[PDB]
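Notes to self after the Tuesday call (sharing in case useful).
The group wants a holo model before anyone commits to mutagenesis around the pocket. I volunteered. Ligand is 6-(benzyloxy)-9H-purin-2-amine. Logging inputs and output together so the record is complete.
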Amino acid sequence: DCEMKRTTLDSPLGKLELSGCEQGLHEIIFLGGGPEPLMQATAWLNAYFHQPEAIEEFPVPALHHPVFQQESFTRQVLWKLLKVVKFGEVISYSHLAALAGNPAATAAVKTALSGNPVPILIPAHRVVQGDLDVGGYEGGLAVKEWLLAHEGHRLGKR
Ligand SMILES: Nc1nc(OCc2ccccc2)c2nc[nH]c2n1
Ligand SMILES: [Zn+2]
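Result:
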C-alpha cells in the first residue's frame, strides 16, 4: 500500500534513490524544494553532503515506512537515534538500547539498526560498539567510516 513516488540524487557515495508517499519518506536506497516529504528529504541529504554546517536548519521529513507506523522497540531505537544523536557524535549500541527503553539489549539494537529504511538521515553510522571499536554496518565498514570522517569524528576514516 501507499502511493509511492521514487526520486534520485547524486552524492559522494553514489546515486541515492528516495521513495515516499504524501505522508512521509519511506526509504533511502543506495543504487551503488517544498513541503512534500520526498522534497524535504532530498534537501536534507543534499545539505548533509554539501552544506553540513547548516544541517540542523533543514527540516527533517515525516517518515512513513511501516516500521514508523506502529509502536515498537525498533521504532524507539530509530526515533531516539534520530532525535538525540547529532552530527559529529557517536553513541554505543548499549547506551542506545537503554535510551530506547531496554538496557543491555545490544543484539536487539543491532538487528533494529540493520532494518533502518532511511540510513544517513537516521544516523545508524553514529552507533558504535565502544570507544575504540566502530562496530558494524550494512554492506561493510567503509561507508560507515567515511560518514564519520565527513563528520570529523575520531572513529572516521576517509
Ligand atoms: N550501527 C550499525 N548499523 C547497521 O546498519 C545500518 C544500515 C542500515 C541500512 C543500510 C546501511 C546501513 C548494522 N548492521 C549490523 N550492525 C550494525 N550497526
Ligand atoms: Zn506511506
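Two things stood out.
Residues 65-154 form a domain with the Arc Repressor Mutant, subunit A fold (CATH 1.10.10.10).
The chain has two domains: 3-64, 65-154.
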